[PDB]
Amino acid sequence: MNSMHPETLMVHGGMDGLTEAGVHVPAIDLSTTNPVNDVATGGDSYEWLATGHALKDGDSAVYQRLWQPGVARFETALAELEHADEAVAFATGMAAMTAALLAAVNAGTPHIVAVRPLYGGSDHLLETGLLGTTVTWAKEAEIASAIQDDTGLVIVETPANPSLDLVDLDSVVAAAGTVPVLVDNTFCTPVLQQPIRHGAALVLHSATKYLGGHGDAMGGIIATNSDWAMRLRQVRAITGALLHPMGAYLLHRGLRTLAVRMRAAQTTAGELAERLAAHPAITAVHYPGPRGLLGRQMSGGAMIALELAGGFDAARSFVEHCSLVVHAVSLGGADTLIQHPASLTHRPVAATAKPGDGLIRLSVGLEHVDDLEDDLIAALDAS
Amino acid sequence: NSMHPETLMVHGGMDGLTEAGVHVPAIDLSTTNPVNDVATGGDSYEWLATGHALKDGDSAVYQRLWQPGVARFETALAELEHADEAVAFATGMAAMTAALLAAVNAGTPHIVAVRPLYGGSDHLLETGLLGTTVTWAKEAEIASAIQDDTGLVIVETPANPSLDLVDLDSVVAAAGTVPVLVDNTFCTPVLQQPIRHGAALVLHSATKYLGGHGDAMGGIIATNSDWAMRLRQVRAITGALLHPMGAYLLHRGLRTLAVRMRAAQTTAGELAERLAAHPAITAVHYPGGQDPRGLLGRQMSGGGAMIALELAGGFDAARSFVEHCSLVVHAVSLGGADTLIQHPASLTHRPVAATAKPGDGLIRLSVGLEHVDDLEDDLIAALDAS
Amino acid sequence: NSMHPETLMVHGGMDGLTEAGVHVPAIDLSTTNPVNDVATGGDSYEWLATGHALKDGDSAVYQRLWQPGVARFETALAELEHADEAVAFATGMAAMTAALLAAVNAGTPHIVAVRPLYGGSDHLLETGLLGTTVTWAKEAEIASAIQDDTGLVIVETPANPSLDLVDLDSVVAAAGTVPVLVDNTFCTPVLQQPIRHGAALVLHSATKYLGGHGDAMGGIIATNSDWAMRLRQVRAITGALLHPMGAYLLHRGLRTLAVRMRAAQTTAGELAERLAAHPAITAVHYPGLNGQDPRGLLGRQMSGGGAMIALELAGGFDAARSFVEHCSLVVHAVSLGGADTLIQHPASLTHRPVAATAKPGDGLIRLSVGLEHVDDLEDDLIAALDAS
Amino acid sequence: MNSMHPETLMVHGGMDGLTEAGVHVPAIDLSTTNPVNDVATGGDSYEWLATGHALKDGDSAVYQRLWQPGVARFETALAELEHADEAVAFATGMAAMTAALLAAVNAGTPHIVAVRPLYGGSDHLLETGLLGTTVTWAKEAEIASAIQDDTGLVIVETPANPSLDLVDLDSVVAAAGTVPVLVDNTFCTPVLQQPIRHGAALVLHSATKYLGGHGDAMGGIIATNSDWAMRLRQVRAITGALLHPMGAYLLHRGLRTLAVRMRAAQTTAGELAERLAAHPAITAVHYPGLDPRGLLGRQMSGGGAMIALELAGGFDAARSFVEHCSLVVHAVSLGGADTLIQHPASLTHRPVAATAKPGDGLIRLSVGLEHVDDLEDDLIAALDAS
Ligand SMILES: CCCC[C@H](N)C(=O)O
Ligand SMILES: CCCC[C@H](N)C(=O)O
Ligand SMILES: CCCC[C@H](N)C(=O)O
Ligand SMILES: CCCC[C@H](N)C(=O)O
């Protein structure tokens, strides 16, 4: 597990002891409750798990809200890829972010210096302050100044959603100093980026996108140090946003095919963005590749943003004229997905010739570049 | 039409399935849902994000906004409980968390909680993790403990693990303008319905009884449209969703609920009576002179499937009792297919001496679907081992 | 063990789970199973290919040889049926197919099958797809129809869809040296146990009652070690395996079987009595009802009337077709033992394109009583009958 | 689904109408029985499905043994990749082969001209004659002579198991003439080999290997013309070796990642066999891309992900090599996510002595999705331990 390449680590990660048990894949244990050997041993295991610690070997899991073996394997698998001490799995990416914010509030640090742009849900949860949080939206150059004596977390996302703007993680961690940094590494995945290497304390992942890879398993996981993992596990035990054994099995199963899926989707996206650049209907294409963020932080990407000349009307027509490419709000699936991010806020437009709002997000799937190029070209021509 | 609860448990939430050509609800694992139009999809997104239910003929947009499998399970329980709508979460604690978070954001962070309460619910209010201020009051101190900042009144009947009953008619009258949340996990919609008494929210830990087999984790609140909208808004941003597989098993479990509860309660009623005639046990706690205010018949149409045993030996006798059981499995849960046993005093105390404290002798027992002779013979053998 | 059937249904097949620290059996989807040693793995392969059960502490080798989830469900039903072992297949027809294939390879392709039999079982013997020769004999013609080439005697009680009872004590006595296969799908191990009467094989379509919710497809035969070995050999090469998910749901369904059967039978016993007092129906077919127990089989063979009812309508096929299409709560589908009440017209499977005719015969309607209230089921069926 | 490249066809194949229904993945319908609209329409659908025909749109599936929608989507998906008229899915690869043999017997053609080498199970099923079949084991050049007026099928497998010897499919179909040809395309998959293009009538696939791709879903499917697909569907309706909805969903899901998995596994295998050739312990390496007949390019667009190893030590060295692997798992299967190793000679021979016999030095290896450096370092360590 230490001398293995990431491709080998994705397949055998979290599969510890399975070869020895006589099985090929991890068993799906749906057990809500777990019987105990001795009242004394079961009571100790209850206190140990309720305090946020990891289940010691040879001890009963006690209850699924305290510990689930299926979830546990998926947690260790991602922690190995991200090179973090431990990982904590939740029902969704928003449930992991919710627990990270709730832990900061209870530790006496309700203030968060978030750096925009951020994912819609993360941006709205901080803005609402539903979990008793204070937010200070600062730019990349205003991080060190926006830090208060009450700050508990610095939430950053690279590449940004949906603009795909890169943020230098080496500068963020240096500006935060004593404050831990949470990096939403959903778009990059552990294949292309590892925020732990740059200095981030927490690495948020929406397992729904890329980690699952098929658009069927909902999930969220944070790869962080033992201290933060304990806080996150304490919140999970009382708030109960658990990952179902079936979801945990499909997310762990999806990690095995992650290296090959990302390598293929990134190759297709690199050619697709270059081919789409040679089009009169698109003014500019947004694809990673000025500070030399590539190589130092990211080893490409499978997402492309397209700014159209027609604005909202051309973007709306482009989304509805796609047949092979599916119009839905998600990413990292098996098929190519398309979405209009401006349409989520500007909805009852009623077909007006808007000058702006012409950005279209696109999540490259596992299809041939010729078929995706021909489909999107057909949709662009329909105007 | 006017359906009996037994029929309503089987066909509830199964609307349109006969017409679609299927026997059981399909398990749609889809994380994202494609949209017909950009304009129609955007409206469905705003409608679902604002906490409203998915209108027919509209895309679910995303699983965090709406899941069809979860939706069927929600309507099935709401019919069983006679509440306007229901909201399903990953666990019973996730439903309680969303109920507390909604109260805080509505400007009512204060909660007047009536003890005894379930371990997790009690610890969540004491910690104040969600920005809540608790005021632990007795049944007769409810109206006095209500502050101008109170948003919810959390009560639980029968209590855990003492099985003490609380008069829901008195609680709702004392709360007045403040909504009442009743944790009806032990009772289920078969024996008790807090909506008919005046409660605004009805919390259920679907893990116990609703699942009925000890394999599906869940939590659901049957409440009025206004409170369901607030709960749905919290679920959309906090994301403590119920997995399609979990939602299918919890809904499937509702069909066999009437027959399971009527059999487990019958076994429990005889088991508690047979355990009373034992030298080791000083007193048995089973609702069915246990009834003080005539709550059975008026609030509960049965004694339930839970029994609490007061042992004479104290902690040591309770510890050996749950360790000598072979057929009865020692675990921390209830409402499963098999009979479960637990020592509630052991979760806080781990002594190395002969202790006889009030509560140390209490043993919780969740009656399963086994024969009363086999359960009596196993527990009688474990008691003799001392 | 000294356990009552109700306790045995819940804890049966759950051996070692309490000790492992789990509440329910794990769902192991593993197609292949790694081996500890080449020598130990090779022995486990030969042992499982020869039709023997997996010895404890040995690799399952491959799913076609052994599946732990299926294994738990097999032992759970073998305990309820009091048979030595049990073999689980994809469907009830896959279990019957393996039973017929084993008989052919043992040099006994002849089967003395007594009618009436289930549609699929009857059609498989008539077609002779597996190289079998059938001899359809009545209950009193069993001993005479037995040839020196007979390998199995297939009987079904109650019959489908007439619900006619067959005396299993007379069948086993007439078969003598020939093993008897009894389809105990309609009765389940709760009300009937063919092993107690002398049957060698007990066929069950786990889809009906054993699953109990209409979601898991299955088939299992509770039989002696010799027939279980023959059956296990056919399953290893023909590969009609039970998927781990299906095996888990069928095993899970056994826990709630005692309470489901007692409730459905109670509802059926009252439903048939209330339906008898109706002008549209001429005769009701229910084992518990008076007139449907000729040899005193209630108590000796069946400890209940079951949850199936057959209705003889005065209008014939058209009254039966109108009755099926006028049901709203009761679902019209071809199956039994589900959570909800199902209705079907058995004559419609063969006499399908009857367009607005007034045929005198074929007025039988099969009904599988579910877990609903007797008042709601009576009110729905009484409304469908009035629609004529 | 016509002008698409195989990589695109693997992702969107069998996903017809899902985008229109508002879902991202096919729903898992576990329904054993299917309700009907009319008695007359339901009876016609029963006869249509029992006679081996595919379900017409807008008709009830009637029963799972007659039709399953989940299985149906997987059959559509594979048949598109194989360019065959229809496909029939069964519980296992052996269940598909069993139905193919049973259909031939009932059509009055119990004779099968099989060409050695064949897969263990397929070879043992023909030798036993359990389904009333008479086999005639003939070489590639003795096909036309071994054909009797009673022959119904010609079963061939390329590459052979475990030798990986290639068979010219153009010569087999020409020698069979009027007799349909069944090709076991398990190892090759529709990515590298297409038997329909060469003239084969039936294409057998063990969906357990490669089609699933993770070692969790058991399956078997035959891509064949409408006539043979009807005869196979008739056998499936009465013999009932059905594919469970969960298995069918995972096998269909696995088709989406098939192109990327086989391109990566084949690349790793092509380098691994070349690196293993430069080793003192191995006398010869068996890998298609290391070709005298010119079958690569004409029949196979790649060397595959399977490698056979001929060791100098015989049985002793092969057994030691299998037990000295730590990263590579010793199990009897192929096409999984991880690299698997097996000793084929050990299944029949369980000896005390060293036993240097022909085939005892052969080791089968199924290349997974790992790095070539990690697999070379592990196998080189296991060889040094021997
Ligand atoms: C919070 C709205 C849901 C948006 C969706 N998760 C996306 O990928 O755009
Ligand atoms: C993890 C809390 C333990 C209490 C447990 N949930 C029960 O119902 O007994
Ligand atoms: C073989 C015809 C199908 C009959 C159906 N399985 C039933 O039990 O009603
Ligand atoms: C154990 C002999 C069967 C061979 C095995 N199914 C494989 O594919 O290697």
The token duo for C230 is: 């023959």
For chain B, how are helix, strand and coil distributed in percent, rounded to 5?
40, 15, 45
Residue written as tokens 């006499």? C351
Q: Can you tell me the distance from the alpha carbon of B75 to that of B329, in angstroms, rounded to the nearest whole number?
A: 33
User: Which among C225, C255, C285 is the end of a domain?
Assistant: C255
Q: Specify the number of domains making up chain B.
A: 2
Q: Can you tell me the distance from the alpha carbon of B222 to that of B225, in angstroms, rounded to the nearest whole number?
A: 10
Q: Are D323 and C37 in contact (CB under 8 A)?
A: yes
My answer on whether A244 and A150 are in the same domain is yes
My answer on whether C227 and C328 are in the same domain is no
- Quick one: which of A337, A346, A358, A378 has its CA closest to A283? A358
Per DSSP (E only), the strands in chain A are 86-90, 111-112, 134-135, 151-157, 181-184, 202-205, 220-224, 282-286, 303-308, 326-327, 337-339, 359-363
Residue A73 exposure: Cα atoms within 13 Å on the Cβ side: 29
Element (H, E) at B172: helix B168-175
My answer on whether B243 and B326 are in the same domain is no
- Quick one: which of B17, B39, B19, B53 has its CA closest to B235? B53
Q: Are D93 and D247 in contact (CB under 8 A)?
A: no
My answer on whether B101 and B202 are in the same domain is yes
User: Residue A132 in 3-state DSSP?
Assistant: coil
Q: What is the DSSP string of D327-351?
A: SSEE-S--S-SS-EEE-GGGGT---
- Under 8 Å CB-to-CB from C204, ≥6 apart: which residues? C77, C92, C95, C183, C184, C185, C188, C210, C219, C220, C221, C222
Element (H, E) at C155: strand C150-156
My answer on whether C22 and C129 are in the same domain is yes
Q: Are B223 and B202 in contact (CB under 8 A)?
A: yes
My answer on whether B144 and B282 are in the same domain is no
The answer to the question of residue B318 being in a domain is yes
User: Which among D229, D256, D283 is the end of a domain?
Assistant: D256
**What are the residues facing B338 on neighbouring strands?**
none
Cα–chain-centroid distance for residue D51?
A: 26
My answer on whether A121 and A268 are in the same domain is no
Chain C nearest-CA distance from D97, in A, is: 8
The number of the ligand nearest the C-alpha atom of A62 reads 2
Per DSSP (E only), the strands in A235-316 are 282-286, 303-308
The alpha helices in B277-371, defined as continuous H runs, are 295-298, 315-323
Residue written as tokens 């009583």? C369
Q: Can you tell me the distance from the alpha carbon of A310 to that of C169, in angstroms, rounded to the nearest whole number?
A: 85
Active site residue D209: yes
Which residues of chain B neighbour C18 with C-beta distances below 8 Å?
329
Tell whether A369 lies on the interface with C, counting CB pairs under 8 A: no
Residue A65 exposure: Cα atoms within 13 Å on the Cβ side: 27
Residue B333 exposure: Cα atoms within 13 Å on the Cβ side: 37
The alpha helices in C21-67, defined as continuous H runs, are 38-49
Q: What's the maximum distance between 2 C-alpha atoms anywhere in chain A?
A: 73
**Residues 31 to 60 of A: which have CB under 8 A from any C CB?**
31-37, 60
**What are the residues facing D28 on neighbouring strands?**
B27
Active site residue D119: yes
The number of the ligand nearest the C-alpha atom of D62 reads 3
- Under 8 Å CB-to-CB from C370, ≥6 apart: which residues? B10, C264, C267, C338, C339, C340, C341, C342, C377
Q: Please list the active-site residues of A.
A: 65, 119, 184, 209
Q: What is the DSSP string of A43-77?
A: HHHHHHHHTT----TTS---BTTT--HHHHHHHHH
Q: Are B89 and B73 in contact (CB under 8 A)?
A: no
Minimal Cα distance from D333: which residue of A?
Answer: A24
Q: Are D326 and A1 in contact (CB under 8 A)?
A: no
Instruction: For residue D44, report the distance from its CA to the centre of ligand 3, in Å.
Output: 14
The number of the ligand nearest the C-alpha atom of A60 reads 2
**What are the residues facing B150 on neighbouring strands?**
B110
My answer on whether C300 and C158 are in the same domain is no
CA distances in angstroms from A267 to A189, A301, B227, listed in the order given: 15, 9, 49
Q: Can you tell me the distance from the alpha carbon of D374 to that of A276, in angstroms, rounded to the nearest whole number?
A: 38
My answer on whether C149 and C226 are in the same domain is yes
Residue written as tokens 């349409």? A343
User: Which among C239, C255, C271 is the end of a domain?
Assistant: C255
Give the domain CATH number at D127. 3.40.640.10
Q: Is B163 left (phi over 0), alpha (psi -120 to 50) or beta?
A: left
The token duo for A70 is: 């299926």
Q: Can you tell me the distance from the alpha carbon of A143 to that of A154, in angstroms, rounded to the nearest whole number?
A: 9
**Residues B123-141 as b or e (16 or more Cβ within 10 Å = b):** ebbeeebbbbebbbbeeee
Q: Can you tell me the distance from the alpha carbon of D182 to that of D193, in angstroms, rounded to the nearest whole number?
A: 14
Q: Can you tell me the distance from the alpha carbon of B125 to that of C105, in angstroms, rounded to the nearest whole number?
A: 70
- Quick one: which of D201, D230, D240, D220 has its CA closest to D103? D230
User: Residue A297 in 3-state DSSP?
Assistant: coil
Which residues of chain C neighbour B263 with C-beta distances below 8 Å?
259, 262
- In angstroms, the first-to-last Cα distance of chain B is 57
Q: Are A81 and A91 in contact (CB under 8 A)?
A: no
| Number of residues assigned to chain C | 388
The answer to the question of residue B335 being in a domain is yes
| Number of residues assigned to chain D | 386
Q: What is the DSSP string of B144-169?
A: HH--TTEEEEEE-SS-TTT-----HH
Q: Are A190 and A81 in contact (CB under 8 A)?
A: yes
Domain of C268? 258-386
Closest residue by CA, ligand 1 atom 4: A329
The answer to the question of residue A22 being in a domain is yes
Residue written as tokens 């294939």? C101
Tell whether B105 lies on the interface with A, counting CB pairs under 8 A: yes
- Quick one: which of B150, B151, B186, B190 has its CA closest to B166? B186
Q: Can you tell me the distance from the alpha carbon of A1 to that of A81, in angstroms, rounded to the nearest whole number?
A: 10
The token duo for B107 is: 């400007």
Q: Can you tell me the distance from the alpha carbon of A189 to that of A298, in angstroms, rounded to the nearest whole number?
A: 10
Q: Can you tell me the distance from the alpha carbon of B320 to that of D126, in angstroms, rounded to the nearest whole number?
A: 61
**What are the residues facing B281 on neighbouring strands?**
B311
Tell whether C18 lies on the interface with A, counting CB pairs under 8 A: yes
Q: Can you tell me the distance from the alpha carbon of D268 to that of D263, in angstroms, rounded to the nearest whole number?
A: 9
Chains that touch A (3 or more CB pairs under 8 A): B, C, D
The token duo for D98 is: 């069993």
Q: Can you tell me the distance from the alpha carbon of A279 to that of A373, in angstroms, rounded to the nearest whole number?
A: 11
- Quick one: which of B196, B276, B210 has its CA closest to B74? B210
- Under 8 Å CB-to-CB from B213, ≥6 apart: which residues? B249, B253, B336, B337, C24, C252, C255, C256
Q: Are A319 and B38 in contact (CB under 8 A)?
A: yes
**Residues 161 to 190 of D: which have CB under 8 A from any C CB?**
none
Neighbours of D346 (CB within 10 A): 22
Q: How was this one solved?
A: X-ray
Neighbours of C149 (CB within 10 A): 11
For this entry, resolution in Å reads: 2.5
Cα–chain-centroid distance for residue A247?
A: 15
Which residues of chain C neighbour A30 with C-beta distances below 8 Å?
24, 27
The answer to the question of residue D63 being in a domain is no
Q: Do B30 and A216 touch (CB under 8 A)?
A: yes
Q: Are C341 and C281 in contact (CB under 8 A)?
A: no
Sheet bearing D306-311, strands edge to edge: D282-286, D306-311, D362-366, D340-342, D329-330
Q: Do B33 and D27 touch (CB under 8 A)?
A: no
**What are the residues facing C366 on neighbouring strands?**
C310, C344
Q: What is the 3-state secondary structure (H, E, C) of D297-315?
A: CCCECCCCCEEEEEECCCH
Cα–chain-centroid distance for residue A281?
A: 31
- Quick one: which of D181, A24, D89 has its CA closest to C90? D89
Cα torsion angle, A11, A14, A18, A19, sign: positive
User: Residue A361 in 3-state DSSP?
Assistant: strand
Closest residue by CA, ligand 3 atom 3: C334
Cα–chain-centroid distance for residue D241?
A: 17
- Quick one: which of B330, B344, B347, B336 has its CA closest to C19? B330
The answer to the question of residue D134 being in a domain is yes
The answer to the question of residue B191 being in a domain is yes
Q: Are C162 and C117 in contact (CB under 8 A)?
A: no
Give the domain CATH number at C348. 3.90.1150.10
| Number of residues assigned to chain B | 386
**What are the residues facing A337 on neighbouring strands?**
A326, A363
The token duo for D276 is: 């293993």
The token duo for D195 is: 């038997």
DSSP character for B55? P
Angle CA(B284)–CA(B288)–CA(B292) in degrees, nearest 5? 90
**Residues B246-273 as b or e (16 or more Cβ within 10 Å = b):** bbbbbbbbbbbbbbbbbbbbbbbbebbe
Q: Is B207 annotated as a binding residue?
A: yes
Chain A nearest-CA distance from B176, in A, is: 27
Cα torsion angle, C211, C212, C216, C221, sign: positive
Residue written as tokens 């005093």? B345
The answer to the question of residue A92 being in a domain is yes
Taking CB atoms within 8 Å and a gap of at least 24, the contacts of D338-343 are: D338/A11, D338/A12, D338/A15, D338/A256, D338/D215, D338/D368, D338/D369, D338/D370, D339/D365, D339/D366, D339/D367, D339/D368, D339/D370, D339/D375, D340/C32, D340/D365, D340/D366, D340/D368, D341/D365, D341/D366, D342/D162, D343/C38, D343/D318, D343/D319
Q: Do C334 and D46 touch (CB under 8 A)?
A: yes
- Quick one: which of C143, C154, C142, C149 has its CA closest to C179? C154
Element (H, E) at C110: strand C110-111
My answer on whether D250 and D271 are in the same domain is no
Q: Please list the active-site residues of B.
A: 64, 118, 183, 208
Which residues of chain B neighbour C23 with C-beta distances below 8 Å?
214-215, 329, 331, 333, 336
Q: Do C239 and D246 touch (CB under 8 A)?
A: no
The alpha helices in chain D, defined as continuous H runs, are 6-12, 18-21, 39-50, 69-82, 93-106, 120-128, 143-146, 169-176, 189-192, 195-198, 226-239, 245-256, 258-277, 315-323, 372-384
Element (H, E) at B110: strand B110-111
Q: What is the 3-state secondary structure (H, E, C) of A180-231?
A: CEEEECCCCHHHHCCHHHHCCCEEEECCCCCCCCCCCCCCEEEEECHHHHHH
Taking the CA atoms of residue A303, residue A306, residue A312 and residue A315 in that order, the dihedral angle to the nearest 10 degrees is -80
Q: Is A295 left (phi over 0), alpha (psi -120 to 50) or beta?
A: left
Taking the CA atoms of residue D219, residue D225, residue D231 and residue D237 in that order, the dihedral angle to the nearest 10 degrees is 40
User: Residue D142 in 3-state DSSP?
Assistant: helix
Nearest to D241 among C62, C239, C335 (CB): C239
- Quick one: which of B35, B99, B92 has its CA closest to B235? B99
CA distances in angstroms from D321 to D21, D285, D345, D361, listed in the order given: 53, 15, 14, 10
**Residues C73-90 as b or e (16 or more Cβ within 10 Å = b):** bbbbbbbbbebebbbbbb
My answer on whether D137 and D149 are in the same domain is yes
Nearest to C60 among A22, A31, A37 (CB): A22
Element (H, E) at C254: helix C244-255
Q: Can you tell me the distance from the alpha carbon of A266 to that of A226, in angstroms, rounded to the nearest whole number?
A: 33
Q: Is A303 annotated as a binding residue?
A: no
Which residues of chain B neighbour C376 with C-beta distances below 8 Å?
3-4, 6-7
Tell whether C4 lies on the interface with A, counting CB pairs under 8 A: no
User: Residue D286 in 3-state DSSP?
Assistant: strand
My answer on whether A216 and A291 are in the same domain is no
CA-B61 nearest atom, ligand 1: 3
The answer to the question of residue A35 being in a domain is no
Q: Can you tell me the distance from the alpha carbon of B327 to that of C10, in angstroms, rounded to the nearest whole number?
A: 10
Q: What is the DSSP string of C338-360?
A: -SS-EEE-GGGGTS----S---S
Q: Can you tell me the distance from the alpha carbon of B203 to that of B86, in angstroms, rounded to the nearest whole number?
A: 10
Q: Can you tell me the distance from the alpha carbon of A10 to that of D370, in angstroms, rounded to the nearest whole number?
A: 8
Burial grade of A219 (CB within 10 A; 0-12, 13-18, 19 or more): buried
The token duo for B317 is: 């006798």
Q: Are A336 and D12 in contact (CB under 8 A)?
A: no
